[PDB]
């Protein structure tokens, strides 16, 4: 009845107010900056030893050690400077889709199709690695569980819900609801008081940790959203979708700024990441390659070729000196 | 220097793990509700035939949208598809599903084994007469007449039809796409067969043999 017509008028007011603050555009302001030029990078290392394809990877805080996951049922910790193997951990379930590394370097977490993000202890007194806790409160598979500190974690699942746990007692504290489809990714703000998520209903939301309520809703895409990440200064973020396009949003203006599309690309994006300064944007594709874009001008400036299957993960070190990419052909490469 | 030695002993253990991984023959089982998917075959199941190991999985623990988690099973040996071939009101739905799996982009090199269960029911329950054509699925009697096989000695011509019905439509979709990289192996079953572990053994042997003959320019 009137509950459908009333919501229609509210949507009109929000759209009308946005046009008032749309005086100029980002494209016509940065027209005096010199372009970057041409960026060339080449492979330096190749890590091999996994038995099947790779889904996830994560860098350490000290920027020397990283952890990777595979669906053969292993979890290997590498030494990037010398390509030495430090640890090897077998898992109970073969189907694993995510992994994380604790900021202090004492714990590692993982999860997958078994509806559990479990925690491992590394600094044991007996000389081995043992399981510490098991958190089970979800109904659908887990796609991302990320550490906050040494005592609490935040997870996203495929039942359209996020949660905040407490490792000491194993009971969750806060539940975030409001999405429509599966939640595919999340990203923490640098100040560690807000985070964003992207679901399969072509929208993104902004939450706050202390309260547990939604703040803003952004919508400019046409299909599912796969990747998301924050700007270095914590006032903007970028997304990637299945319509072969990346977009940039502003929190203060609550609207869109730029679009990164090309006429010869007809495949979706699987991962995005920023550089240390924030001027270059990296993206992985299903046509076996990766592209480098100029954030302030939206024109391509490079390419990385050499993988055999599609790239599934991508990361940049804390000090911004190297890039690591995984793929479905079970290899890891380090560029520059 | 002593840390390089430790790294080499980790690699010897990984070599022994690769020997067992290669001879395992993982399988995927997916069907529909009220299809008798359980009695024919608990996420994981183990069985051994002629000292050969098999491992089969069931993923009945999520919602009804499966366009995201189905991309994990892109390198299994085969897929088992189960159909409750006794009801006609829900038979058009079963065809659509098959069509989405066959034409998917990430599952272009995987073969499918087809089981047409619920045979004893259709022998007599529907033979008495409670359904016809143009009132239910109008494609099992579009003037069909096959002459290549008449098994089961002793019956009138319309016995296997209610299970023979489904055979043609799944072959219309199968033979119209896919050059030489995957095939289909239909089977007829029931609720008391004890030889279903042998049919999988034989059908998995033809998949490996056909793959080697093609790369030697012999097939």
């Amino acid at each position, epitope marked *: 009845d009137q509950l459908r017509q009333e919501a229609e008028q509210l949507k009109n007011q929000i759209r009308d107010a946005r046009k008032a603050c749309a005086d100029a555009t980002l494209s016509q302001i940065t027209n005096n900056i010199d372009p970057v030029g041409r960026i060339q990078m080449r492979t330096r290392r190749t890590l091999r030893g996994h038995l099947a394809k790779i889904y996830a990877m994560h860098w350490g805080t000290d920027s020397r050690l990283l952890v990777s996951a595979s669906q053969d049922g292993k979890l290997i910790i590498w030494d990037s400077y010398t390509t030495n193997k430090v640890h090897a951990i077998p898992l109970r379930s073969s189907w694993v889709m995510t992994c994380a590394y604790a900021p202090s370097g004492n714990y590692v977490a993982c999860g997958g199709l078994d509806n559990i993000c479990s925690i491992y202890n590394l600094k044991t007194r007996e000389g081995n690695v043992r399981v510490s806790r098991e958190l089970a409160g979800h109904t659908g598979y887990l796609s991302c569980c990320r550490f906050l500190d040494d005592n609490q974690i935040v997870t996203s699942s495929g039942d359209t819900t996020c949660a905040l746990w407490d490792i000491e007692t194993g009971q969750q504290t806060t539940t975030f609801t409001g999405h*429509t489809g599966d939640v595919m990714s999340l990203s923490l703000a640098p100040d560690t008081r807000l985070f964003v998520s992207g679901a399969c209903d*072509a929208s993104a939301k902004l939450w706050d940790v202390r309260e547990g309520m939604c703040r803003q809703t952004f919508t400019g895409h046409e299909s599912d959203i796969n990747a998301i990440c924050f700007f270095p200064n914590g006032n903007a973020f970028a997304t990637g979708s299945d319509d072969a396009t990346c977009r940039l949003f502003d929190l203060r203006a609550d609207q869109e700024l730029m679009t990164y599309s090309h006429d010869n690309i007809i495949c979706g994006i699987t991962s995005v990441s920023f550089s240390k300064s924030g001027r270059l944007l990296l993206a992985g594709y299903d046509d076996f390659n990766c592209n480098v874009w100029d954030a302030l001008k939206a024109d391509r400036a490079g390419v990385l070729a050499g993988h055999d299957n599609r790239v599934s993960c991508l990361g940049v070190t804390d000090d911004g000196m190297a890039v690591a990419t995984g793929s479905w052909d079970s290899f890891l490469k380090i560029w520059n | 220097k002593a840390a390089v030695e430790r790294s080499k002993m980790i690699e010897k253990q990984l070599q022994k793990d690769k020997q067992v991984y290669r001879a395992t023959h993982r399988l995927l089982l997916l069907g529909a509700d009220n299809s008798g998917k359980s009695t024919i075959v608990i996420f994981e199941t183990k069985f051994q035939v002629d000292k050969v190991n098999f491992h089969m999985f069931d993923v009945g623990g999520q919602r009804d*949208e499966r366009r995201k988690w189905i991309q994990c099973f892109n390198d299994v040996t085969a897929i088992i598809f189960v159909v409750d071939s006794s009801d006609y009101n829900r038979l*058009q739905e079963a065809l659509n599903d098959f069509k989405s799996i066959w*034409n998917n*982009r990430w599952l272009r090199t995987i073969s499918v084994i087809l089981f047409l269960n619920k045979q004893d029911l259709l022998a007599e329950k529907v033979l008495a007469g409670k359904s016809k054509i143009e009132d239910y699925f*109008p494609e099992f009697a579009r003037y069909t007449t096959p002459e290549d096989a008449t098994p089961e000695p002793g019956e009138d011509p319309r016995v296997t039809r209610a299970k023979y019905f489904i055979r043609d439509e799944f072959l219309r979709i199968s033979t119209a796409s896919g050059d030489g990289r995957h095939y289909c192996y239909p089977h007829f079953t029931c609720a008391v067969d004890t030889e279903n572990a042998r049919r999988i053994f034989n059908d998995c042997r033809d998949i490996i043999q056909r793959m080697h003959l093609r790369q030697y320019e012999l097939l």
Partner: nanobody
Amino acid sequence: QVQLQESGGGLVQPGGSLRLSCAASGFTFSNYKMNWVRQAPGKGLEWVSDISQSGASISYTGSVKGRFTISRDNAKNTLYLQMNSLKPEDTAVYYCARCPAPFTRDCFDVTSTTYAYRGQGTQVTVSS
């Protein structure tokens, strides 16, 4: 915004005819596959028909062959459906769904009440 809106529908006599349209906005209409879905009173959802990106491949379900027609207009972002000689068992609610992942030849839709890209529906009643 991927808004989809349907127009038409109402009380009809047996043997009557109706005409429906599905206006669309918020995406490039000439890159996706479109289709119709209906839901009977107190039952599930049943796929009905679909049309390819250009208008070359057309499919129907077995129960409506010879009575339904589908067509699209790429220059106006519309989708049509023609009905003839309706039977009393045609009373249902008709929706207008869109396939995701453009430049692709399969769909994963007609799930339970959780699909994002779908319309609201219009009421059709054929009785006397």
